[PDB]
Write an enzyme that holds these catalytic residues in place. Structure first.
Site, PDB file in Angstrom:
ATOM      1  N   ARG A  36       0.648  -1.097  -0.512  1.00  0.00           N
ATOM      2  CA  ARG A  36      -0.528  -0.267  -0.333  1.00  0.00           C
ATOM      3  C   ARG A  36       0.270   1.332  -0.321  1.00  0.00           C
ATOM      4  O   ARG A  36       1.980   1.570   1.035  1.00  0.00           O
ATOM      5  CB  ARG A  36      -1.165   0.102   1.179  1.00  0.00           C
ATOM      6  N   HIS A  95       8.970   1.644   3.102  1.00  0.00           N
ATOM      7  CA  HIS A  95       8.531   0.291   3.744  1.00  0.00           C
ATOM      8  C   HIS A  95       9.695   0.155   3.585  1.00  0.00           C
ATOM      9  O   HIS A  95      10.742   0.649   2.877  1.00  0.00           O
ATOM     10  CB  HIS A  95       7.650  -0.234   2.862  1.00  0.00           C
ATOM     11  N   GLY A  96       9.926  -1.362   4.289  1.00  0.00           N
ATOM     12  CA  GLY A  96      11.175  -2.227   4.803  1.00  0.00           C
ATOM     13  C   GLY A  96      10.697  -3.484   5.374  1.00  0.00           C
ATOM     14  O   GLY A  96       9.667  -3.956   5.174  1.00  0.00           O
ATOM     15  N   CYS A 138       9.433  -0.569   8.335  1.00  0.00           N
ATOM     16  CA  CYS A 138       9.225  -1.924   8.579  1.00  0.00           C
ATOM     17  C   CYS A 138      10.041  -2.754   8.661  1.00  0.00           C
ATOM     18  O   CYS A 138      11.012  -2.353   7.677  1.00  0.00           O
ATOM     19  CB  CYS A 138       7.705  -2.587   8.119  1.00  0.00           C
TER      20      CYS A 138
END
Lengths: 229, 212, 5
Positions: A36, A95-96, A138
């Site tokens: 997302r 994001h991660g 993340c």
């Protein structure tokens, strides 16, 4: 009993890599199809911007960066002349997963590969000066190996979460970690609190709201404070 | 109104167990004396193999006694890799430090949930379940061990002196000054004699190793 | 909705 010199104006550059648009992580990279877009990250970028401009850093924002772009931006800062600066800050919002951050194009960049570009040998004009990284992302998919930075002194990495786990982002309010970090820096720096003490307070606030557990990793060897005008 | 808002309770007698695992055997009684003075119950194991380490840590993590203590400390001295320890074993794949973490996490080790779990590691090289941990990893070159008159860890000895003389100060405040000292020592020697110090933690409260 | 990153 020493404190890092923090008096130059500006104090240094505050790079902000803000990733919102993850289309390609679904248009060019097969496995992140359900990834997302990071709604609310703009509030985070704005909070960081106002928090650090107040603390006299020169903000350098960059939005939606692929991994290739992140590397070229970081390379430009590695080569810049920081000789009149007392500090360097690099914030990465994206994001991660386990030990890494994702570029908008779904490619990966190990956090260690990013921070290690600023060792004294590689960036002499920051040798002996604090290099601070704040990463909102993340670090896995667990909800409730890398050592992230070089072992040489003067590095501070503030991670939104321990490795292997996720971090939360409220689309209307920003991420728990960044919003808490900015609020504490804004309220506590003027009171003379050092940055590590502030990060423990952030660990506490965020962990009180699944649960999220932030985690500082660092090799600092003096007290770090950002004197507030 | 100061931060952090809370302080880890430190009242139990003893304050907790101080588990010392010295696979090399060069350390002096200094660190053990200091932690006993602080109020810890010290238990020492020398020259353990990786298996021995996993087994002693695993065991200690389930000690019902933790329920009565307010904290836990582990000092680990061993040859090892970037993020693992070999014990006395001749191997290149040691016990990764994250596994040590797994053994003491809130779920695995419930009697220490919400209590500060501190790890001081001297490595010689060539509630959320992950809360309240404090990791101190010092890496120095194995060649410091290859001397005719081996020197005890400057890192562990400095840690002991700071705790012995300033036990009422926050642990992290003390450790940043310890890092400054290691940095000063390092500024006098080549890489094979330096002590690098790396820290990582998930503390949520003020942490002072002294009776609250 | 509270999203994870």
């Amino acid at each position: 009993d020493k404190v890092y010199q923090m008096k130059s104006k500006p104090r240094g550059y505050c790079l902000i890599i803000n990733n919102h648009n993850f289309a390609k992580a679904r248009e060019k990279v097969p496995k992140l199809h359900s990834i997302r877009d990071r709604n609310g990250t703009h509030l985070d970028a704005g909070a960081l911007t106002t928090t650090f401009e107040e603390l006299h850093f020169e903000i350098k924002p960059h939005d939606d960066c692929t991994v290739e772009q992140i590397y070229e931006i970081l390379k430009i800062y590695q080569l810049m002349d920081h000789s009149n600066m007392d500090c360097f800050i690099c914030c990465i919002l994206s994001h991660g997963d386990k030990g890494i951050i994702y570029g908008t194009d779904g490619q990966e960049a190990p956090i260690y590969e990013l921070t290690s570009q600023f060792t004294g040998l590689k960036c002499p004009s920051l040798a002996g000066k604090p290099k601070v990284f704040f990463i909102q992302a993340c670090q896995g998919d667990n909800y409730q190996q890398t050592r992230y930075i070089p072992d040489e002194a003067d590095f501070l990495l503030g991670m939104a979460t321990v490795n292997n786990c996720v971090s939360y982002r409220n689309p209307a309010e920003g991420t728990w970690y960044i919003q808490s970090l900015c609020q504490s820096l804004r309220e506590r720096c003027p009171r003379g609190d050092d940055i590590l003490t502030i990060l423990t307070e952030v660990n506490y606030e965020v962990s009180n709201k699944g649960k999220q557990m932030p985690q500082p990793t660092f090799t600092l060897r003096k007290k770090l404070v950002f004197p507030s005008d | 109104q100061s931060i952090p808002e809370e302080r880890y309770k430190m009242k139990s007698k003893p304050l907790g167990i101080c588990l010392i695992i010295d696979c090399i055997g060069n350390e002096t009684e200094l660190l053990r004396d200091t932690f006993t003075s602080l109020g810890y119950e010290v238990q020492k194991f020398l020259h353990l193999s990786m298996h021995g380490i996993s087994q002693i840590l695993g065991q200690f993590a389930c000690m019902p006694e933790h329920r009565d203590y307010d904290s836990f400390v582990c000092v680990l001295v061993s040859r090892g890799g970037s993020q693992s320890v070999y014990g006395v074993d001749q191997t290149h794949s040691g016990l990764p430090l994250h596994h040590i973490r797994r053994m003491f996490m809130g779920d695995s080790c419930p009697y220490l949930a919400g209590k500060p779990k501190m790890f001081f590691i001297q490595n010689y090289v060539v509630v959320h379940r992950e809360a309240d941990f404090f990791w101190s990893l010092c890496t120095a070159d194995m060649s410091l061990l290859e001397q005719s008159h081996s020197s005890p860890s400057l890192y562990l000895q400095c840690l002991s002196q700071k705790l012995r003389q300033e036990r009422k100060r926050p642990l992290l405040d003390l450790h940043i000054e310890l890092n400054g000292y290691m940095y000063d020592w390092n500024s006098r020697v080549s890489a094979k004699e330096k002590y690098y110090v790396w820290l990582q933690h998930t503390l949520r409260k003020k942490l002072i190793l002294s009776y609250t | 909705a509270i999203e994870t990153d």
